Short mmCIF file of all heavy atoms in Angstrom, two decimals:
data_model
loop_
_atom_site.label_atom_id
_atom_site.label_comp_id
_atom_site.label_asym_id
_atom_site.label_seq_id
_atom_site.Cartn_x
_atom_site.Cartn_y
_atom_site.Cartn_z
N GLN B 8 -21.52 -20.42 -10.75
CA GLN B 8 -21.06 -19.18 -10.13
C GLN B 8 -19.69 -19.36 -9.50
O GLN B 8 -18.85 -18.46 -9.57
CB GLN B 8 -22.08 -18.69 -9.11
CG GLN B 8 -22.17 -17.17 -9.00
CD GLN B 8 -23.25 -16.71 -8.04
OE1 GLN B 8 -24.31 -17.33 -7.94
NE2 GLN B 8 -22.99 -15.62 -7.33
N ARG B 9 -19.45 -20.51 -8.88
CA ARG B 9 -18.16 -20.75 -8.24
C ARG B 9 -17.04 -20.85 -9.27
O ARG B 9 -15.94 -20.33 -9.06
CB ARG B 9 -18.22 -22.02 -7.39
CG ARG B 9 -16.99 -22.23 -6.52
CD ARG B 9 -16.70 -21.01 -5.66
NE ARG B 9 -17.79 -20.75 -4.72
CZ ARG B 9 -17.87 -19.68 -3.93
NH1 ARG B 9 -16.92 -18.76 -3.92
NH2 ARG B 9 -18.92 -19.55 -3.13
N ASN B 12 -16.28 -17.47 -10.48
CA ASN B 12 -15.42 -16.86 -9.47
C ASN B 12 -13.97 -17.29 -9.64
O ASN B 12 -13.06 -16.46 -9.54
CB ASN B 12 -15.93 -17.23 -8.08
CG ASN B 12 -15.08 -16.64 -6.95
OD1 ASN B 12 -14.26 -15.76 -7.16
ND2 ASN B 12 -15.28 -17.16 -5.75
N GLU B 16 -10.90 -14.77 -10.48
CA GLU B 16 -9.74 -14.66 -9.61
C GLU B 16 -8.45 -14.95 -10.38
O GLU B 16 -7.43 -14.29 -10.16
CB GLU B 16 -9.88 -15.61 -8.42
CG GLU B 16 -10.91 -15.16 -7.40
CD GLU B 16 -10.32 -14.31 -6.30
OE1 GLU B 16 -9.21 -13.77 -6.49
OE2 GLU B 16 -10.96 -14.18 -5.24
N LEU B 19 -7.66 -11.88 -12.46
CA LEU B 19 -7.18 -10.79 -11.62
C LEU B 19 -5.74 -11.01 -11.18
O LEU B 19 -4.92 -10.08 -11.21
CB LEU B 19 -8.09 -10.63 -10.40
CG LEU B 19 -9.46 -9.99 -10.62
CD1 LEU B 19 -10.38 -10.27 -9.45
CD2 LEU B 19 -9.32 -8.49 -10.84
N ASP B 22 -3.44 -10.45 -14.13
CA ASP B 22 -3.28 -9.03 -14.42
C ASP B 22 -2.36 -8.36 -13.41
O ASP B 22 -1.56 -7.49 -13.78
CB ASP B 22 -4.65 -8.35 -14.45
CG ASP B 22 -5.49 -8.80 -15.62
OD1 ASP B 22 -4.99 -9.61 -16.44
OD2 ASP B 22 -6.65 -8.35 -15.74
N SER B 53 -8.73 14.50 -21.46
CA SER B 53 -8.73 13.95 -20.12
C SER B 53 -7.54 14.48 -19.32
O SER B 53 -6.52 14.91 -19.88
CB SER B 53 -8.68 12.42 -20.16
OG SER B 53 -7.62 11.96 -20.97
N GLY B 54 -7.68 14.45 -18.00
CA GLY B 54 -6.62 14.91 -17.12
C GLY B 54 -5.45 13.96 -16.98
O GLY B 54 -4.43 14.35 -16.40
N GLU B 57 -1.87 8.48 -20.96
CA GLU B 57 -0.99 7.33 -20.76
C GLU B 57 -0.14 7.13 -22.00
O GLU B 57 -0.66 6.85 -23.09
CB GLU B 57 -1.81 6.07 -20.47
CG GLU B 57 -2.17 5.88 -19.00
CD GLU B 57 -3.49 5.16 -18.82
OE1 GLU B 57 -3.94 4.50 -19.78
OE2 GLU B 57 -4.07 5.24 -17.72
N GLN B 75 -5.05 17.91 -15.57
CA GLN B 75 -6.00 18.09 -14.48
C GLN B 75 -5.99 19.56 -14.08
O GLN B 75 -4.97 20.08 -13.62
CB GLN B 75 -5.63 17.19 -13.30
CG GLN B 75 -6.25 15.81 -13.37
CD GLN B 75 -7.76 15.83 -13.24
OE1 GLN B 75 -8.31 16.59 -12.45
NE2 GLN B 75 -8.43 15.00 -14.03
N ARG B 76 -7.13 20.23 -14.26
CA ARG B 76 -7.15 21.69 -14.32
C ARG B 76 -6.74 22.32 -12.99
O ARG B 76 -5.94 23.27 -12.97
CB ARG B 76 -8.53 22.17 -14.75
CG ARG B 76 -9.07 21.43 -15.96
CD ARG B 76 -8.52 22.00 -17.26
NE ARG B 76 -8.98 21.26 -18.42
CZ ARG B 76 -8.21 20.47 -19.16
NH1 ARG B 76 -6.93 20.31 -18.89
NH2 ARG B 76 -8.74 19.83 -20.20
N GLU B 78 -6.75 22.04 -8.28
CA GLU B 78 -6.90 21.38 -6.99
C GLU B 78 -6.24 20.00 -6.99
O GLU B 78 -6.88 18.95 -6.92
CB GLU B 78 -8.38 21.31 -6.57
CG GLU B 78 -8.59 20.86 -5.14
CD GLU B 78 -9.89 21.37 -4.56
OE1 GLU B 78 -10.52 22.24 -5.19
OE2 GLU B 78 -10.27 20.90 -3.47
N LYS B 81 -6.29 17.07 -3.30
CA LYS B 81 -7.10 15.99 -2.76
C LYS B 81 -7.34 14.86 -3.76
O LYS B 81 -8.33 14.13 -3.64
CB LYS B 81 -8.42 16.55 -2.24
CG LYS B 81 -8.23 17.81 -1.41
CD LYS B 81 -9.54 18.47 -1.04
CE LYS B 81 -10.50 17.47 -0.43
NZ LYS B 81 -10.10 17.08 0.96
N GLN B 84 -3.06 11.54 -3.83
CA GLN B 84 -2.79 10.30 -3.11
C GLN B 84 -2.86 9.07 -4.00
O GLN B 84 -2.42 8.00 -3.58
CB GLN B 84 -3.77 10.14 -1.95
CG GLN B 84 -5.18 9.79 -2.38
CD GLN B 84 -6.11 10.98 -2.38
OE1 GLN B 84 -5.69 12.11 -2.17
NE2 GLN B 84 -7.40 10.73 -2.61
N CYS B 85 -3.40 9.20 -5.22
CA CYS B 85 -3.44 8.08 -6.15
C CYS B 85 -2.08 7.77 -6.75
O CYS B 85 -1.93 6.73 -7.40
CB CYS B 85 -4.44 8.37 -7.27
SG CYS B 85 -6.10 8.78 -6.71
N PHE B 86 -1.08 8.64 -6.55
CA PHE B 86 0.23 8.50 -7.16
C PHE B 86 1.32 8.30 -6.12
O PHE B 86 2.48 8.65 -6.36
CB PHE B 86 0.56 9.70 -8.04
CG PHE B 86 -0.44 9.96 -9.13
CD1 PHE B 86 -1.26 11.07 -9.08
CD2 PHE B 86 -0.56 9.10 -10.20
CE1 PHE B 86 -2.18 11.32 -10.08
CE2 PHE B 86 -1.47 9.33 -11.20
CZ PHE B 86 -2.28 10.44 -11.14
N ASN B 87 0.98 7.76 -4.95
CA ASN B 87 2.01 7.50 -3.95
C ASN B 87 2.78 6.22 -4.21
O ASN B 87 3.83 6.01 -3.59
CB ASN B 87 1.39 7.47 -2.54
CG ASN B 87 0.22 6.51 -2.44
OD1 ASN B 87 -0.09 5.78 -3.37
ND2 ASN B 87 -0.44 6.52 -1.28
N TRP B 122 2.46 12.01 0.78
CA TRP B 122 2.28 10.81 -0.04
C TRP B 122 3.54 10.42 -0.80
O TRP B 122 3.71 9.25 -1.14
CB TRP B 122 1.13 11.01 -1.02
CG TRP B 122 -0.15 11.41 -0.36
CD1 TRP B 122 -0.77 12.63 -0.43
CD2 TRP B 122 -0.98 10.59 0.47
NE1 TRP B 122 -1.93 12.61 0.31
CE2 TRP B 122 -2.08 11.37 0.87
CE3 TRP B 122 -0.90 9.27 0.92
CZ2 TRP B 122 -3.09 10.88 1.70
CZ3 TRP B 122 -1.90 8.78 1.74
CH2 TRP B 122 -2.98 9.58 2.12
N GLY D 44 -11.04 -10.04 -3.69
CA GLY D 44 -10.75 -10.19 -5.11
C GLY D 44 -9.86 -9.10 -5.67
O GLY D 44 -8.97 -9.37 -6.48
N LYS D 48 -5.97 -0.15 -4.16
CA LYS D 48 -6.81 0.70 -3.31
C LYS D 48 -8.25 0.71 -3.81
O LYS D 48 -8.51 0.90 -5.00
CB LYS D 48 -6.26 2.12 -3.29
CG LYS D 48 -4.89 2.26 -2.66
CD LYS D 48 -4.73 3.63 -2.03
CE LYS D 48 -3.28 3.95 -1.75
NZ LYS D 48 -2.87 5.20 -2.44
N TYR D 50 -11.65 2.69 -3.95
CA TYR D 50 -12.01 4.09 -3.88
C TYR D 50 -13.51 4.36 -3.79
O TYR D 50 -13.89 5.44 -3.34
CB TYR D 50 -11.45 4.85 -5.09
CG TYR D 50 -10.04 5.36 -4.89
CD1 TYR D 50 -9.00 4.92 -5.69
CD2 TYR D 50 -9.76 6.28 -3.89
CE1 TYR D 50 -7.72 5.39 -5.50
CE2 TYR D 50 -8.48 6.75 -3.69
CZ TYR D 50 -7.46 6.30 -4.50
OH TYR D 50 -6.18 6.77 -4.31
N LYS D 69 -9.92 -2.08 -12.50
CA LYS D 69 -10.88 -3.17 -12.45
C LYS D 69 -12.15 -2.71 -11.75
O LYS D 69 -12.08 -2.13 -10.66
CB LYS D 69 -10.30 -4.39 -11.73
CG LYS D 69 -9.34 -5.21 -12.57
CD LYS D 69 -10.10 -6.03 -13.60
CE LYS D 69 -9.18 -7.02 -14.29
NZ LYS D 69 -9.92 -7.90 -15.24
N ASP D 74 -21.03 -10.76 -4.66
CA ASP D 74 -22.24 -11.48 -4.25
C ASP D 74 -22.17 -11.56 -2.73
O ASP D 74 -21.44 -12.39 -2.19
CB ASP D 74 -22.31 -12.85 -4.90
CG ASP D 74 -23.67 -13.50 -4.75
OD1 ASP D 74 -24.52 -12.94 -4.03
OD2 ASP D 74 -23.89 -14.57 -5.36
N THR D 78 -19.80 -15.14 -0.76
CA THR D 78 -18.70 -14.41 -1.37
C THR D 78 -18.30 -15.02 -2.71
O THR D 78 -17.86 -16.16 -2.78
CB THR D 78 -17.49 -14.36 -0.43
OG1 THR D 78 -17.76 -13.45 0.64
CG2 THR D 78 -16.24 -13.91 -1.17
N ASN D 79 -18.48 -14.25 -3.78
CA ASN D 79 -18.37 -14.77 -5.13
C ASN D 79 -18.22 -13.58 -6.07
O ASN D 79 -18.41 -12.43 -5.69
CB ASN D 79 -19.58 -15.63 -5.50
CG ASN D 79 -19.34 -16.52 -6.69
OD1 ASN D 79 -19.20 -16.05 -7.82
ND2 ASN D 79 -19.28 -17.83 -6.45
N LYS D 80 -17.84 -13.88 -7.32
CA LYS D 80 -17.69 -12.86 -8.35
C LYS D 80 -18.71 -13.12 -9.44
O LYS D 80 -18.75 -14.21 -10.01
CB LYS D 80 -16.28 -12.87 -8.94
CG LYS D 80 -15.17 -12.96 -7.92
CD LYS D 80 -15.18 -11.86 -6.91
CE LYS D 80 -13.76 -11.57 -6.47
NZ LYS D 80 -13.41 -12.26 -5.20
N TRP D 90 -7.76 5.04 -13.31
CA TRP D 90 -7.73 6.18 -12.40
C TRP D 90 -9.14 6.55 -11.97
O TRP D 90 -9.54 7.72 -12.00
CB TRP D 90 -7.00 7.35 -13.04
CG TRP D 90 -5.61 6.99 -13.46
CD1 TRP D 90 -5.14 6.88 -14.73
CD2 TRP D 90 -4.52 6.67 -12.59
NE1 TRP D 90 -3.81 6.52 -14.71
CE2 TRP D 90 -3.41 6.38 -13.40
CE3 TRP D 90 -4.37 6.60 -11.20
CZ2 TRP D 90 -2.17 6.03 -12.88
CZ3 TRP D 90 -3.14 6.26 -10.68
CH2 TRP D 90 -2.06 5.98 -11.52
N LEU D 108 -10.14 10.44 -12.65
CA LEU D 108 -9.26 11.47 -13.19
C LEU D 108 -9.36 11.62 -14.70
O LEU D 108 -8.85 12.61 -15.24
CB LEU D 108 -7.81 11.17 -12.79
CG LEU D 108 -7.50 11.20 -11.30
CD1 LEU D 108 -6.14 10.60 -11.02
CD2 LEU D 108 -7.56 12.62 -10.78
N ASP D 109 -10.00 10.68 -15.40
CA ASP D 109 -10.12 10.73 -16.85
C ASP D 109 -11.17 11.72 -17.34
O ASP D 109 -11.44 11.76 -18.54
CB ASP D 109 -10.43 9.34 -17.40
CG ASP D 109 -11.59 8.68 -16.69
OD1 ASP D 109 -12.02 9.20 -15.64
OD2 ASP D 109 -12.09 7.65 -17.19
N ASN D 110 -11.79 12.48 -16.43
CA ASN D 110 -12.74 13.55 -16.78
C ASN D 110 -13.96 13.00 -17.51
O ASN D 110 -14.59 13.70 -18.30
CB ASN D 110 -12.07 14.63 -17.62
CG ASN D 110 -11.15 15.52 -16.81
OD1 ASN D 110 -11.34 15.70 -15.62
ND2 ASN D 110 -10.16 16.11 -17.48
N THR D 134 -14.99 19.02 -17.42
CA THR D 134 -13.63 19.53 -17.50
C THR D 134 -12.93 19.47 -16.14
O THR D 134 -12.08 20.30 -15.84
CB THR D 134 -13.62 20.96 -18.03
OG1 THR D 134 -14.19 21.85 -17.06
CG2 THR D 134 -14.41 21.06 -19.33
N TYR D 136 -12.08 16.41 -12.66
CA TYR D 136 -12.05 14.99 -12.31
C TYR D 136 -13.39 14.57 -11.70
O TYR D 136 -13.92 15.23 -10.80
CB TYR D 136 -10.91 14.70 -11.33
CG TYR D 136 -11.04 15.35 -9.97
CD1 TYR D 136 -11.52 14.64 -8.89
CD2 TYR D 136 -10.66 16.67 -9.77
CE1 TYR D 136 -11.64 15.23 -7.65
CE2 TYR D 136 -10.77 17.27 -8.54
CZ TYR D 136 -11.26 16.54 -7.48
OH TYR D 136 -11.37 17.13 -6.24
N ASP D 177 -14.69 22.71 -6.18
CA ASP D 177 -15.02 21.40 -6.72
C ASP D 177 -15.90 20.62 -5.75
O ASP D 177 -15.89 20.83 -4.54
CB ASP D 177 -13.74 20.63 -7.07
CG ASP D 177 -12.86 20.34 -5.87
OD1 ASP D 177 -13.18 20.78 -4.75
OD2 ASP D 177 -11.84 19.65 -6.06
N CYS D 195 -15.60 21.55 -1.49
CA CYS D 195 -14.44 21.99 -0.72
C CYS D 195 -14.51 23.45 -0.31
O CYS D 195 -13.62 23.92 0.41
CB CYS D 195 -13.15 21.75 -1.51
SG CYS D 195 -12.76 20.02 -1.78
N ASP D 219 -13.30 21.04 3.75
CA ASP D 219 -13.78 20.35 2.56
C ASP D 219 -14.73 19.22 2.92
O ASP D 219 -14.42 18.39 3.78
CB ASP D 219 -12.59 19.80 1.77
CG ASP D 219 -11.46 20.81 1.64
OD1 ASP D 219 -11.74 22.02 1.63
OD2 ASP D 219 -10.29 20.38 1.55
N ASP D 237 -13.56 17.21 6.27
CA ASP D 237 -12.21 17.08 6.78
C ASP D 237 -12.01 17.79 8.11
O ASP D 237 -10.91 17.73 8.67
CB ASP D 237 -11.20 17.63 5.76
CG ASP D 237 -10.99 16.69 4.60
OD1 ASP D 237 -11.56 15.58 4.62
OD2 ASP D 237 -10.25 17.06 3.66
N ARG D 305 -6.83 2.86 5.30
CA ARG D 305 -7.92 3.82 5.38
C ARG D 305 -9.16 3.33 4.64
O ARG D 305 -9.08 2.86 3.51
CB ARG D 305 -7.47 5.16 4.82
CG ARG D 305 -8.56 6.21 4.76
CD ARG D 305 -8.09 7.44 4.01
NE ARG D 305 -6.83 7.91 4.55
CZ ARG D 305 -6.22 9.04 4.19
NH1 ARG D 305 -6.76 9.85 3.30
NH2 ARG D 305 -5.06 9.36 4.75
#
Side-chain angles (χ1 to χ4, degrees):
Chain B
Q8 213 176 324
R9 189 54 63 186
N12 179 14
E16 288 269 18
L19 285 163
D22 292 358
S53 52
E57 274 149 19
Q75 272 294 320
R76 313 278 177 251
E78 190 154 349
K81 314 173 51 73
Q84 73 259 7
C85 305
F86 303 111
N87 52 6
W122 305 110
Chain D
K48 296 209 196 122
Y50 272 118
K69 282 285 189 176
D74 192 353
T78 286
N79 198 291
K80 315 302 211 263
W90 303 112
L108 296 168
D109 51 348
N110 285 333
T134 69
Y136 65 99
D177 62 357
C195 293
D219 315 330
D237 285 356
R305 176 189 308 187

